[PDB]
Amino acid sequence: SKVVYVSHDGTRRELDVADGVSLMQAAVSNGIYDIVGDCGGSASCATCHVYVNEAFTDKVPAANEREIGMLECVTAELKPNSRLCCQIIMTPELDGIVVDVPDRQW
């Protein structure tokens, strides 16, 4: 399924991501370096922050309490559509999802 990652400076990237792969893992394995993924995907760092495009927010499963807790530590602006993309698991349902990558992770 397609996932589009748009950087803060407007750089666009698109990946074909397998079912079951997180949007962090895909970004980190394919040169989308403005997502760091420091903790390896356990909602333990805040360096996989993205802004989920408003056309897709009701297709994406809700954040759990651990993610909500960690989202309080993001360094970029925290917005209503902020997510930790290691918590977003690719499914055919999410084909075409656009995420905007913030201007900082550290």
Partner: protein
């Protein structure tokens, strides 16, 4: 020797495993540790060895404990309770400062950038060995590879390798001249002038980047840079040396598995993950910051708990037939690089080292075995390992690319 049982510890939870000297170490390291996972052993045990400490035996508990630094602190990560390096002993939020700086030097962008250099290093080593029909892999490849990677990243000359090998070996596989503290002081004595030189005149090498970096909004101190650089060296050595050795030990004994990868080199990345799970090798832990009930066991403030990274992937609850190597496993579940906010900073670099090693070795020396008469000796501890790995091959079955 057995520390007296604290009275808060239930007698029926006592299992006196000694992580430095486990029984049946001749069956293999991971086999020796997997005694903790037999069906009658509880999920959480106390050993009276090494001062007395808890051990979590199952992946589910290991992961949960690593996700809760509020109760399970890194302030005292090693058993026994009696080493500074940064950021091993720091919890968030302060630990995050040093993760950010370390990522500038061993992060995925640097690892992607270095891939061709790493392949060239591996090929040069392997081509030097190929015609000889033998090597001690541990010394001839497993150590020179990652140390040469470090010298490359850190902008350090080739002529310093022997000295750094010697000191790092005294730190981790001590021949017994130097204490750990002496060896560490000597490593610091080598780094200090280099750090001072690269603060006065920076380059673009990893020591320049760490040593001119920021933490907490101010320039890093020379002493913080030294402690970070020491870990970036020792952290990628002990683990890689021993892990590569475990893997090649296994491939030397396993012709069908070797053949899978010779015929289908596209399966190497998957194989690397499956070897990471089967031959996992680290066991550190955490200290209780307060009294806390965990999985029906009352833990006391100050108690240490071993949370052995090794064990999570060997847990039959996490992977069926866990002692079997199956490169086609649908989900390889493990915590070999750790879990939570301290998950190995080197995890990307380590995977590329393993993948490049397997691809470049098998293409040149496809068929090899353990030297006749050898019995491979293992050690157990914080990083478990292989003392030496004598391999042999027929040079007529090899190929120079």
């Amino acid at each position: 020797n057995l520390a007296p049982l604290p009275p808060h510890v239930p007698e029926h939870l006592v299992f006196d495993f000694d992580m430095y000297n486990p029984s049946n170490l001749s069956a293999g390291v991971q086999e020796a540790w997997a005694v903790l996972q037999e069906s009658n052993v509880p999920d959480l045990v106390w050993t009276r060895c090494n001062g007395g400490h808890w051990i979590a035996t199952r992946g589910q508990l290991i992961r949960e404990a690593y996700e809760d630094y509020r109760h399970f602190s890194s302030e005292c990560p090693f058993i026994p309770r009696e080493y500074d390096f940064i950021p091993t002993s720091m919890d968030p939020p302060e630990q995050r400062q040093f993760r950010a700086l370390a990522n500038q030097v061993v992060g995925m962008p640097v690892v992607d950038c270095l891939e061709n250099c790493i392949q060239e290093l591996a090929c040069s080593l392997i081509e030097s060995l190929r015609p000889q029909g033998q090597c001690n892999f541990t010394e001839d490849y497993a150590e020179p590879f990652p140390i040469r990677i470090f010298m490359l990243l850190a902008g350090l000359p080739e002529e310093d390798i022997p000295h750094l090998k010697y000191l790092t070996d005294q730190m981790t596989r001590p021949d017994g001249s130097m204490t750990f503290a002496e060896a560490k002081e000597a490593l610091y004595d080598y780094l200090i002038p280099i750090i001072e030189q690269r603060r006065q005149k920076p380059g673009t090498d990893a020591i320049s980047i760490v040593a001119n970096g920021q933490v907490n909004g101010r320039p890093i101190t020379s002493d913080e840079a030294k402690r970070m650089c020491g870990l970036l060296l020792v952290g990628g050595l002990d683990t890689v040396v021993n892990f590569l050795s475990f893997s090649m030990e296994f491939l030397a004994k396993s012709p069908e598995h070797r053949q899978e990868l010779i015929e289908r080199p596209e399966r190497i990345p998957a194989a690397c993950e499956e070897l990471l799970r089967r031959f996992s090798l680290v066991a550190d832990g955490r200290i209780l910051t307060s009294d806390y009930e965990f999985h029906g066991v009352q833990l006391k403030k100050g108690d240490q708990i071993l949370l052995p990274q090794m064990l999570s992937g060997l847990d039959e609850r996490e992977n069926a037939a866990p002692m079997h190597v199956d490169f086609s496993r649908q989900k390889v579940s493990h915590t070999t690089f750790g879990h939570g906010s301290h998950l190995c900073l080197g995890q990307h670099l380590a995977r590329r080292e393993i993948i490049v090693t397997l691809k470049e070795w098998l293409t040149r020396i496809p068929d090899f075995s353990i030297a006749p008469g050898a019995q491979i000796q293992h050690k157990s501890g914080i990083v478990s390992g292989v003392q030496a790995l004598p391999l042999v091959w027929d040079p007529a079955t090899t190929k120079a690319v």
